[PDB]
């Protein structure tokens, strides 16, 4: 059934699974027309498909050309997501196919179930968790590859960089969700915290700075402070 706080450790067991977030698939700027009407302009999007055990992020770039001459784009976006996830599973050898796909939004269940009819043994699950994967486009290198794409593309990232050499996948997932929760709540403040010390750089193939263990502890503390601060402001408590 549904993934929650109670069955959380399951994400880090040896059954291959993927999270699928479709939030950033269909993206628009809203603007005024010459006649003073409103119109949308689609910009490039992405599917965020993450193995929470290994950090492998299958970033399918959704080029604006996929929306050309289509209607009901917020509905089509869910089905295009399910089509690309299905294609990704079919592309993998049997021993690498997931046993479960967890969708971050319930509206993805039927589109993905229908696209995955050929895989009756893959469980399609919702989650009770409010995961901050929508903030993926606040990670500078992911945003850069999506906006530069001139055609459909899939780019494989490791969203945990080399963290798994030093920490478990439970801890790496916790660090990733804290970073993304921070970026989602206050992107400017979050990015200021991460990039404040210019001595600490981002490796060419990494997404995040090369913090020492002790620097991660300080970074992680600063991210928690940011989230509580913004919370007291949101709710005046």
């Amino acid at each position: 059934g549904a993934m929650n706080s109670s069955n959380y450790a399951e994400l880090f067991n040896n059954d291959i699974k993927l999270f699928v977030d479709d939030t950033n698939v269909y993206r628009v700027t809203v603007h005024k027309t010459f006649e003073g009407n409103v119109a949308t302009k689609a910009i490039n999007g992405c599917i965020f498909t993450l193995n929470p055990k290994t950090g492998h992020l299958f970033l399918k770039i959704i080029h604006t050309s996929v929306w050309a001459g289509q209607k009901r784009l917020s509905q089509l976006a869910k089905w295009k997501t399910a089509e690309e996830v299905s294609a990704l599973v079919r592309s993998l050898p049997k021993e690498e196919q997931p046993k479960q796909i967890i969708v971050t939004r319930k509206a993805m269940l039927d589109p993905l179930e229908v696209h995955m009819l050929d895989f009756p043994n893959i469980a399609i699950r919702p989650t009770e968790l409010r995961l901050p994967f929508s903030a993926a486009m606040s990670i500078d290198k992911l945003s850069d590859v999506v906006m530069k794409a001139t055609e459909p593309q899939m780019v494989l990232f490791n969203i945990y960089d080399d963290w798994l050499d030093r920490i478990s996948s439970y801890t790496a997932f916790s660090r990733l969700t804290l970073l993304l929760r921070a970026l989602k709540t206050n992107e400017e403040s979050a990015k200021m915290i991460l990039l404040s010390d210019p001595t600490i750089t981002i490796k060419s193939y990494h997404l995040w700075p090369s913090f020492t263990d002790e620097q991660w502890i300080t970074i992680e503390s600063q991210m928690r402070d940011l989230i509580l601060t913004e919370y007291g402001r949101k709710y005046n408590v």
């Binding site: 509905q75 089509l76 089905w79 399910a82 089509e83 039927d110 589109p111 179930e113 229908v114 696209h115 009819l117 050929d118």
Partner: peptide, 16 residues
């Protein structure tokens, strides 16, 4: 939500 009800390549079309 059966292969009988859904033609490969017409997933969204045949479901909706």
């Amino acid at each position: 939500k059966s292969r009988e009800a859904i033609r490969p390549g017409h997933e969204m079309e045949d479901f909706l």
